């Protein structure tokens, strides 16, 4: 038989990365580019439709527009590699490559998307300069859900209040917020650790000088 080979059937991919997923098919001498047909699909979405040595863009699902390319140089070496730019959680799923070249076969590939809380926004506001009470806030987005552990500079656990909402900036991604209210002094250090539930990303918060530009 003419058989499409897949060197791996499972890709774990990092949110926002580029992935290349490979279908291997036999090519002996120079390939008849005309004869070659390559389809890539994820579930019901068409990604790549390569026929008569060209792509039909008119048939590609919009969610794969500008971000999906067949590597045409690879085609000569029996390689139907699909590259997807800026991978999101919606790109997780089962991919099929379909090749017709002296016969016709398909293979399934599973893509999983890992979305870590690796990016942490922080904010330190004084609540009352007299008590020296401050509000420390860390936020990050990821999947799945995360707890936030607040630690002192001596790595003792402090109690904060966490708020988990569905991201508005993207989809399926959780937006996690924790704030620590504590009486503290300039140059004291705090850590907030995002710990996914079911990896540990830590930010350093340094207490700044009390601002002198403040109303009564």
């Amino acid at each position: 038989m003419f058989t499409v080979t897949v060197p791996k059937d499972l890709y774990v991919v990092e949110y926002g990365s580029n992935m290349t997923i490979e279908c291997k098919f036999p090519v002996e001498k120079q390939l008849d580019l005309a004869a070659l047909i390559v389809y890539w699909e994820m579930e019901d979405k068409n990604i790549i439709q390569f026929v008569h040595g060209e792509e039909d863009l008119k048939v590609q699902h919009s969610s794969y527009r500008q971000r999906a390319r067949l590597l045409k140089d690879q085609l000569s070496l029996g390689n139907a590699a699909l590259q997807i730019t800026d991978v999101k959680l919606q790109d997780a799923g089962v991919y099929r490559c379909m090749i017709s070249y002296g016969g016709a076969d398909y293979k399934r590939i599973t893509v999983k998307v890992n979305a870590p809380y690796n990016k942490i926004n922080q904010r330190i506001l004084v609540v009352d300069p007299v008590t020296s009470e401050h509000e420390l806030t860390c936020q990050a987005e990821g999947y799945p859900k995360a707890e936030v552990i607040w630690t002192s500079s001596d790595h003792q656990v402090l109690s904060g209040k966490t708020t988990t909402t569905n991201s508005k900036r993207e989809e399926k991604l959780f937006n996690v917020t924790s704030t620590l209210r504590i009486n503290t002094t300039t140059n004291e250090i705090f850590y907030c650790t995002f710990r996914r539930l079911d990896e540990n990303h830590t930010a350093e918060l340094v207490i700044p000088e009390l601002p002198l530009a403040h109303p009564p």
Partner: nanobody
Framework: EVQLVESGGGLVQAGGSLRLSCAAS????????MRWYRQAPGKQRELVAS???????YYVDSVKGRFTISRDNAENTLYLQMNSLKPEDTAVYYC????????????WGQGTQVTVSS
Amino acid sequence: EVQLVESGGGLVQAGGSLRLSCAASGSISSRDVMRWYRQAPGKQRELVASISSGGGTYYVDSVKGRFTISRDNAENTLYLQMNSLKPEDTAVYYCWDLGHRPYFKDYWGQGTQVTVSS
């Protein structure tokens, strides 16, 4: 599963013309790509003409400007108009279809003999 039945083959003299027809029955689609191949006696089977879903066509060099592949999706019929026949056009012509609807599969007709007398 799909059946392809080619027709129109026969005896034509050089400079003559004929239309081949392929009737496709079963799990067909306007998204399927279809083709005409031919095999001269003890030569290798070659691709003659190709039509994509988008109606985009490829022709082998030896038939460019003489042969026209077209599709009627309503009647599930593929056509080859063969003009300015030459003796080397003599072959069995096979209809071909790449199915995607149930699964991804290609299907072959049994072929139709074309004989170009000089």
